[PDB]
């Protein structure tokens, strides 16, 4: 799924999904 790869690139330099 190409949705997967784009999200991979996002979280390289954005706050991780589990950090509040």
């Amino acid at each position, epitope marked *: 799924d190409s949705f997967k790869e784009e999200l991979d690139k996002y979280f390289k330099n954005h*706050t991780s999904p*589990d950090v509040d």
Partner: antibody
Amino acid sequence: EVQLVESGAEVKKPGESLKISCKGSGYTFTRYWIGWVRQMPGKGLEWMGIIYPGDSDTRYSPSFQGHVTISADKSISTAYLQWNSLKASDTAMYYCARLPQYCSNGVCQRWFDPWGQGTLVTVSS
Amino acid sequence: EIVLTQSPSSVSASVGDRVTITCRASQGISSWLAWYQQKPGKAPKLLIYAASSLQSGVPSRFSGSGSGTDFTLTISSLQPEDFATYYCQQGNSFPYTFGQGTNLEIKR
């Protein structure tokens, strides 16, 4: 539960090759930087490098660049620490760890959670 | 590199005691200091990140504070499972570095 599982202890002679592994589960591996830390016997913690499994971008500490290679296989959610020619001074506990981050305007700050159980490496003649 | 100096190197204390450990950074790191606990043979465990944020599942008797270069970990009332070695770590800039560790042992 987020978990990192590492490979079994190794006993090697100087000059041999070695690859050790760190498998992640319970999270999306390609969405967190992964780090390696060395702890020599009876000493503290030394950061070695990090990798982003999404695209295998790596960043080494100056103290370890050249002697060790960090890589990842995102297809099996596994990161690696590899040496072409071990030295007895490599004898240590090695840990991998996930690095959650906070970022604002492209600028990111990191800490280590969770940590793998460690791989013991003994290099001797 | 940013050197982190922990003091004192060893602390002697009993169950119920209040203990404070300090971490001094050689350059300013804003608030990006973390504290770990490590027992012999075992992997480190995160207690506190971003100087004062409690890691979920860690008891509030652990609390961190400070900014800039001077940081403190405080254990308000020591429990038997708290005897261990503690490390600070800065994640503000490369290379990432750790303090040399403080050993918390049992007084008698």
